[PDB]
Amino acid sequence: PSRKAKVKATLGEFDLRDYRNVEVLKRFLSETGKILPRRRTGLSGKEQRILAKTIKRARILGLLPFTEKLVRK
Amino acid sequence: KRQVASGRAYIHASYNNTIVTITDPDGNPITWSSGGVIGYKGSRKGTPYAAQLAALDAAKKAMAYGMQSVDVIVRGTGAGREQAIRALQASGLQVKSIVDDTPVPHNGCRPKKKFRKAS
Amino acid sequence: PITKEEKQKVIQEFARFPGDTGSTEVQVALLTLRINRLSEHLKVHKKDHHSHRGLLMMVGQRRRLLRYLQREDPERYRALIEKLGIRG
Amino acid sequence: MRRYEVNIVLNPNLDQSQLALEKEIIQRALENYGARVEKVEELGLRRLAYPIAKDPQGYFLWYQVEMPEDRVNDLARELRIRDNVRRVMVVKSQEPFLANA
RNA sequence: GUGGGAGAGGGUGGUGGAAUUCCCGGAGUAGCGGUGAAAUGCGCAGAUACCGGGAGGAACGCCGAUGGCGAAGGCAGCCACCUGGUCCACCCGUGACGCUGAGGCGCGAAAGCGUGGGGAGCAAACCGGAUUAGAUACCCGGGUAGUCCACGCCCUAAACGAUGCGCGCUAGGUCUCUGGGUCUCCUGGGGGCCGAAGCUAACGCGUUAAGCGCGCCGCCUGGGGAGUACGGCCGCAAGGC
Ligand SMILES: [K+]
Ligand SMILES: [K+]
Ligand SMILES: [K+]
Ligand SMILES: [K+]
Ligand SMILES: [K+]
Ligand SMILES: [K+]
Ligand SMILES: [K+]
Ligand SMILES: [K+]
Ligand SMILES: [K+]
Ligand SMILES: [K+]
Ligand SMILES: [K+]
Ligand SMILES: [K+]
Ligand SMILES: [Mg+2]
Ligand SMILES: [Mg+2]
Ligand SMILES: [Mg+2]
Ligand SMILES: [Mg+2]
Ligand SMILES: [Mg+2]
Ligand SMILES: [Mg+2]
Ligand SMILES: [Mg+2]
Ligand SMILES: [Mg+2]
Ligand SMILES: [Mg+2]
Ligand SMILES: [Mg+2]
Ligand SMILES: [Mg+2]
Ligand SMILES: [Mg+2]
Ligand SMILES: [Mg+2]
Ligand SMILES: [Mg+2]
Ligand SMILES: [Mg+2]
Ligand SMILES: [Mg+2]
CA distance B107 to chain A (A): 13
User: Beta carbon of B53 within 7 Å of strand E?
Assistant: no
Domain that holds residue A18: 1-73
Q: What CATH number has the domain bearing residue A33?
A: 4.10.640.10
The residue type found at A48 is Q
Q: Give B70's strand partners.
A: B7
Checking each nucleotide's C1' against the CA of C50, the nearest proves to be E10
**In chain D, where the domains are located:** 1-101
Q: What CATH number has the domain bearing residue B63?
A: 3.30.420.80
Long-range contacts of range A22-27, CB-CB < 8 Å, 24 or more positions apart?
A22/A58, A22/A63, A22/A64, A22/D46, A25/A51, A25/A54, A25/A55, A25/A58, A25/A64, A26/A64
Determine the CATH number of domain C1-88.
1.10.287.10
Resolution, Å (one decimal): 3.7
In sequence order, the 6+-apart residues with CB closer than 8 A to the CB of C80 are C25, C28, C29, C66, C69, C86
User: Beta carbon of A43 within 7 Å of strand E?
Assistant: no
Q: Which chains touch D (3 or more CB pairs under 8 A)?
A: A
Chain E bases closer than 7 angstroms to a protein Cβ: 1-3, 6-20, 26-39, 48-53, 57-65, 67, 70-73, 77-85, 92-98, 106-108, 120-124, 139-141, 151-152, 176-179
The residue type found at B74 is V
Do D75 and D29 touch, CB atoms closer than 8 A? yes
User: Beta carbon of B66 within 7 Å of strand E?
Assistant: no
Structural domain count, chain B: 1
Residue C38, SS3?
Answer: helix
Contact between chains at A62 and D98 (C-beta distance less than 8 A) = no
| Nearest Cα to Cα of residue B3 among B34, B32, B25, B20 | B25
DSSP annotation string for chain B: ----EEEEEEE---SS--EEEEE-TTS-EEEEEETTTSS--SGGGSSHHHHHHHHHHHHHHHHHTTEEEEEEEE-S--TTSHHHHHHHHTTTSEEEEEEE-----SS-S---GGG-S--
Q: Is the dihedral of CA D49, D50, D52, D53 positive or negative?
A: positive
DSSP character for D69? G
The H-assigned helical ranges of chain A are 22-25, 38-41, 45-58
Technique behind the model:
X-ray
Residue C80, SS3?
Answer: helix
Using CA atoms, how far apart are residues A69 and C43, in angstroms rounded to an integer?
51
Through-space separation of residue A43 CA and nucleotide E172 C1' in angstroms: 32
Domain that holds residue B3: 1-119
CATH class of D1-101: alpha beta
Do D25 and D14 touch, CB atoms closer than 8 A? no
DSSP character for C83? I
Contact between chains at D100 and A50 (C-beta distance less than 8 A) = no
Distances (CA, A) of D92 to D4, D6, D34, D64: 4, 9, 16, 10
